[PDB]
Amino acid sequence: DLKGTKTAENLKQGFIGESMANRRYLYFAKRADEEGYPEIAGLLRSIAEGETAHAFGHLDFIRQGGLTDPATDKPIGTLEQMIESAIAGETYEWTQMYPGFAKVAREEGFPEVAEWFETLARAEKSHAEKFQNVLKQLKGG
């Protein structure tokens, strides 16, 4: 059983890092695209595919071990549970996280960032609603 072990925690941290790596490399690739470095952009994109394989591998061990979603601490064994995890995360983001981030940004004098956080808050609310509709489809039959 992996529950409660350090390995369980390391699988979680491993997933976080790999997720960030893929986003970072694809972001970097756009800069290489812009400047005319197709070889470098291509490498970034290919290595990014590697980080995807790594992240999914971590999730397989987590799922197969009965561990929870690194992002929501919710089970992800079944498709229904996966959707429920998506809903939980999106709900936290639009009801508390992004609104809180936006408030702090305004308070610190960064209205541009605040507006970005507010845009995202509304976006995650829409995502949550979309996922809830999917859950009703699955559980409804």
By CB under 5 A, name the one of 9, 127, 131, 135 that touches Zn ion. Answer: 127
* Interaction residues for a copy of itself, span 6-35 (CB under 8 A): 6-7, 10-11, 14-28, 30-32, 35
Residue ranges of alpha helices (H) inside 36-110 are 38-64, 79-92, 98-107
Smallest Cα–Cα separation from 69: which of 78, 129, 131?
78
Structure tokens at 14: 């491993």
Half-sphere exposure of 110 (CA within 13 A, CB side): 11
- Asked if 54 is part of the footprint of Fe ion (rule: CB under 5 A), the reply reads yes
- Cβ closer to a copy of itself: 21 or 95? 21
Quick one: which of 38, 124, 130, 139 contacts Zn ion (CB under 5 A)? Answer: 124
- 118 part of the interface to a copy of itself, by CB under 8 A: no
- 84 or 124, CB closer to Zn ion? 124
Q: Which is nearer to Zn ion, 2 or 135 (CB)?
A: 135
Number of helices and strands in the chain (H, E): 5, 0
Minimum CB–partner distance for residue 18 and Zn ion (Å): 8
Cα distance between residue 89 and residue 76, in whole Å = 13
By C-beta, is 84 or 90 nearer to Zn ion? Answer: 90
